[PDB]
């Protein structure tokens, strides 16, 4: 029922479980990229390059 106390109100619980083994990380989260400011002596790193 939608008339519960906070202790028993329906809570959506998602257990995001991360896993490592002798395999490459087929799932990553590298969603942090700079922009492309060009033609200056700078530090570039093209995805590990």
């Amino acid at each position, epitope marked *: *029922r939608p*008339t*519960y*106390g*906070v*202790g*028993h109100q329906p809570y959506r619980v998602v257990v995001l479980s991360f896993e490592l083994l002798h395999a490459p990380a087929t799932v990553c989260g590298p969603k942090k990229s700079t922009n492309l400011v060009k033609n200056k002596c700078v530090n570039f790193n093209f995805n590990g390059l």
Partner: antibody, heavy 114, light 108 residues
Framework: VQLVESGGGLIQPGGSLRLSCAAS????????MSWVRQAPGKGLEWVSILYAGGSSFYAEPVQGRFTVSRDNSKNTLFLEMNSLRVEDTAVYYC??????????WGQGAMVTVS | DIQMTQTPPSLSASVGDRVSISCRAS??????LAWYQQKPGKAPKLLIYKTSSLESGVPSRFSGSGSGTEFTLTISSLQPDDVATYYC?????????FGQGTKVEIKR
């Protein structure tokens, strides 16, 4: 938390009762509550449990007869005994059930069916 | 069904003495047994649950142990707060089964 029960008295066989028990110090819609009767000269018998979600779980003998409920606004557990039997006489206690079990015991209401 | 038996039904011991009481189930319950203390005219107080966990508030002198079929409560030293009846309850989400009760009194 104090559980204060009322309605303890005499009732004819086959009659209807509504035992009450106010819970003080906690919100009834946030904890498990239970009805447990102790007959004179016997151990305890947990007869029913109402969850904080309104999910009523009755024992098979009391399934279809007794109605466990809670008034969150009044914060009071109620038990609607229906189709009473001779064996339904006992000191009936409202109680608070938890992960660990029954921690808060009501003072109890006597119930005599004869 | 599942029936638990308590021994001794008639025990007279003195304050300071141990009170060794035994409650045995006919078959294995694993760990779903609890020790309670009830006085006449009073409701039982849960002394120990899971047969090894000290219930919060009950004196540590009570040492409940056991599994499966057999269980034993040991009052290390009797005290006047321990002069009462003792029950063992098989734990179940439904009605379950309770012990017959070991009434402990002051020996004289």
């Amino acid at each position: 938390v104090q559980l204060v029960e009322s309605g303890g008295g005499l009732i004819q066989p086959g009659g209807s009762l509504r035992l009450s028990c106010a819970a003080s110090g906690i919100i009834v819609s946030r904890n498990y509550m239970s009805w447990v009767r102790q007959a004179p000269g016997k151990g305890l018998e947990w007869v029913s449990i109402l969850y904080a979600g309104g999910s009523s779980f009755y024992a098979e003998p009391v399934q279809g007869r007794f109605t466990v409920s809670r008034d969150n606004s009044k914060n009071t557990l109620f038990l609607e005994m229906n189709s009473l039997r001779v064996e339904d006489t006992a000191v009936y206690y409202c109680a608070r059930d938890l992960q660990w079990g029954i921690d808060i015991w009501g003072q109890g209401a006597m119930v005599t069916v004869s | 069904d599942i029936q638990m038996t308590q021994t001794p039904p008639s025990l007279s011991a003195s304050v300071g003495d141990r009170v060794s009481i035994s409650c045995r189930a006919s078959q294995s319950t694993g760990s779903w047994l609890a020790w309670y203390q009830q006085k006449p005219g009073k409701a039982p107080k849960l002394l120990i649950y899971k047969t090894s966990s000290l219930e919060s508030g009950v004196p540590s002198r009570f040492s409940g142990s056991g599994s499966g079929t057999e269980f034993t409560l040991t009052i290390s030293s009797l005290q006047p707060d321990d002069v009462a009846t003792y029950y063992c309850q098989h734990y179940d989400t439904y009605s379950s089964t309770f012990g017959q009760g070991t009434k402990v009194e002051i020996k004289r």
